[PDB]
Design a protein around this motif. Structure first.
Motif, PDB file in Angstrom:
ATOM      1  N   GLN A  51       0.846  -1.193   0.000  1.00 35.59           N
ATOM      2  CA  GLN A  51       0.000   0.000   0.000  1.00 35.59           C
ATOM      3  C   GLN A  51       0.871   1.228   0.000  1.00 35.59           C
ATOM      4  N   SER A  52       0.347   2.316  -0.549  1.00 38.18           N
ATOM      5  CA  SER A  52       1.049   3.585  -0.631  1.00 38.18           C
ATOM      6  C   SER A  52       0.154   4.754  -0.187  1.00 38.18           C
ATOM      7  N   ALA A  53       0.795   5.761   0.384  1.00 36.51           N
ATOM      8  CA  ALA A  53       0.170   6.978   0.829  1.00 36.51           C
ATOM      9  C   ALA A  53       1.093   8.134   0.483  1.00 36.51           C
ATOM     10  N   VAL A  54       0.507   9.265   0.101  1.00 32.83           N
ATOM     11  CA  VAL A  54       1.254  10.497  -0.169  1.00 32.83           C
ATOM     12  C   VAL A  54       0.498  11.710   0.399  1.00 32.83           C
ATOM     13  N   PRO A  55       1.230  12.770   0.722  1.00 28.95           N
ATOM     14  CA  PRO A  55       0.648  13.992   1.289  1.00 28.95           C
ATOM     15  C   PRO A  55      -0.679  14.435   0.657  1.00 28.95           C
ATOM     16  N   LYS A  56      -1.490  15.162   1.429  1.00 24.52           N
ATOM     17  CA  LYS A  56      -2.846  15.577   1.012  1.00 24.52           C
ATOM     18  C   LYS A  56      -2.846  16.529  -0.191  1.00 24.52           C
ATOM     19  N   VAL A  57      -1.768  17.304  -0.330  1.00 27.56           N
ATOM     20  CA  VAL A  57      -1.610  18.281  -1.418  1.00 27.56           C
ATOM     21  C   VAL A  57      -1.350  17.669  -2.810  1.00 27.56           C
ATOM     22  N   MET A  58      -1.267  16.341  -2.875  1.00 26.80           N
ATOM     23  CA  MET A  58      -1.214  15.596  -4.134  1.00 26.80           C
ATOM     24  C   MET A  58      -2.070  14.341  -4.015  1.00 26.80           C
ATOM     25  N   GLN A  92       0.795  21.265  -7.249  1.00 27.10           N
ATOM     26  CA  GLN A  92       1.446  22.285  -6.406  1.00 27.10           C
ATOM     27  C   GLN A  92       2.961  22.121  -6.446  1.00 27.10           C
ATOM     28  N   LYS A  93       3.397  20.980  -6.988  1.00 25.16           N
ATOM     29  CA  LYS A  93       4.798  20.682  -7.267  1.00 25.16           C
ATOM     30  C   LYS A  93       5.686  20.757  -6.018  1.00 25.16           C
ATOM     31  N   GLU A  94       5.153  20.232  -4.913  1.00 20.71           N
ATOM     32  CA  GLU A  94       5.893  20.117  -3.653  1.00 20.71           C
ATOM     33  C   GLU A  94       6.714  18.836  -3.644  1.00 20.71           C
ATOM     34  N   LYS A  95       7.604  18.712  -2.662  1.00 19.51           N
ATOM     35  CA  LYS A  95       8.502  17.548  -2.550  1.00 19.51           C
ATOM     36  C   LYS A  95       7.657  16.299  -2.328  1.00 19.51           C
ATOM     37  N   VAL A  96       7.925  15.246  -3.095  1.00 21.19           N
ATOM     38  CA  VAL A  96       7.148  14.017  -3.005  1.00 21.19           C
ATOM     39  C   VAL A  96       7.785  13.078  -1.983  1.00 21.19           C
ATOM     40  N   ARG A  97       6.996  12.688  -0.994  1.00 23.19           N
ATOM     41  CA  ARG A  97       7.382  11.701  -0.001  1.00 23.19           C
ATOM     42  C   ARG A  97       6.282  10.645  -0.067  1.00 23.19           C
ATOM     43  N   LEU A  98       6.629   9.384  -0.275  1.00 22.57           N
ATOM     44  CA  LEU A  98       5.641   8.311  -0.306  1.00 22.57           C
ATOM     45  C   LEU A  98       5.796   7.411   0.909  1.00 22.57           C
ATOM     46  N   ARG A  99       4.700   7.141   1.588  1.00 19.58           N
ATOM     47  CA  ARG A  99       4.712   6.186   2.686  1.00 19.58           C
ATOM     48  C   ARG A  99       4.220   4.854   2.158  1.00 19.58           C
ATOM     49  N   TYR A 100       4.982   3.784   2.331  1.00 18.60           N
ATOM     50  CA  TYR A 100       4.522   2.487   1.838  1.00 18.60           C
ATOM     51  C   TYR A 100       4.402   1.526   3.012  1.00 18.60           C
ATOM     52  N   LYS A 101       3.590   0.498   2.829  1.00 17.79           N
ATOM     53  CA  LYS A 101       3.440  -0.599   3.773  1.00 17.79           C
ATOM     54  C   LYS A 101       3.632  -1.873   2.996  1.00 17.79           C
ATOM     55  N   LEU A 102       4.534  -2.732   3.465  1.00 19.79           N
ATOM     56  CA  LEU A 102       4.845  -4.018   2.831  1.00 19.79           C
ATOM     57  C   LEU A 102       4.616  -5.172   3.788  1.00 19.79           C
ATOM     58  N   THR A 103       3.855  -6.144   3.317  1.00 21.72           N
ATOM     59  CA  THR A 103       3.567  -7.333   4.069  1.00 21.72           C
ATOM     60  C   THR A 103       3.596  -8.500   3.100  1.00 21.72           C
TER      61      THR A 103
END
Length: 129
Positions: A51-58, A92-103
């Motif tokens: 699974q992946s998650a990214v900031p609300k602004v994208m 908005q072209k802000e810095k991309v940080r992705l949160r992932y979950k691996l199982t």
């Protein structure tokens, strides 16, 4: 120039992020992240949850992966692969940080991890990838 980034690499199970844009002259505000999961491990990988998650602004725009399990690698046969496509809409072209979950399960164990991927190309390059 822009290379795949390794998000996971253990036991022969590799999850990579491949960056692209749509091959037709499209918008330089969306990133096509192709997630490849290839196993060369000697045991099957099962119950793969990524699974992946990214900031609300994208917006994430995740689609379902091609699969959920990978067979034991054997030199005679074709290594199987999971693909998954993410469309990262970041106007908005802000810095991309992705949160992932691996199982996943392999051998007699279940593996769980979560972390941050921060090696996305600069938003300026979205259009020339």
């Amino acid at each position: 120039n822009i290379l795949p980034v390794t998000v996971y690499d253990q036991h022969g199970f590799r999850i990579l992020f491949h960056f692209a844009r749509d091959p037709l002259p499209g918008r330089s505000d969306v990133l096509v992240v192709v997630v490849s999961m290839l196993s060369t491990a000697p045991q099957p990988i099962r119950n793969i949850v990524f699974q992946s998650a990214v900031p609300k602004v994208m917006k994430v725009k995740l689609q379902p992966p091609s699969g959920t399990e990978l067979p034991a690698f054997n030199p005679i046969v074709h290594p199987s692969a999971i693909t998954q496509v993410l469309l990262l809409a970041n106007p908005q072209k802000e810095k991309v940080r992705l949160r992932y979950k691996l199982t996943f399960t392999m051998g007699d164990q279940t593996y769980n991890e979560m972390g941050d991927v921060d090696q996305f190309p600069p938003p300026e390059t979205w259009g020339s990838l």
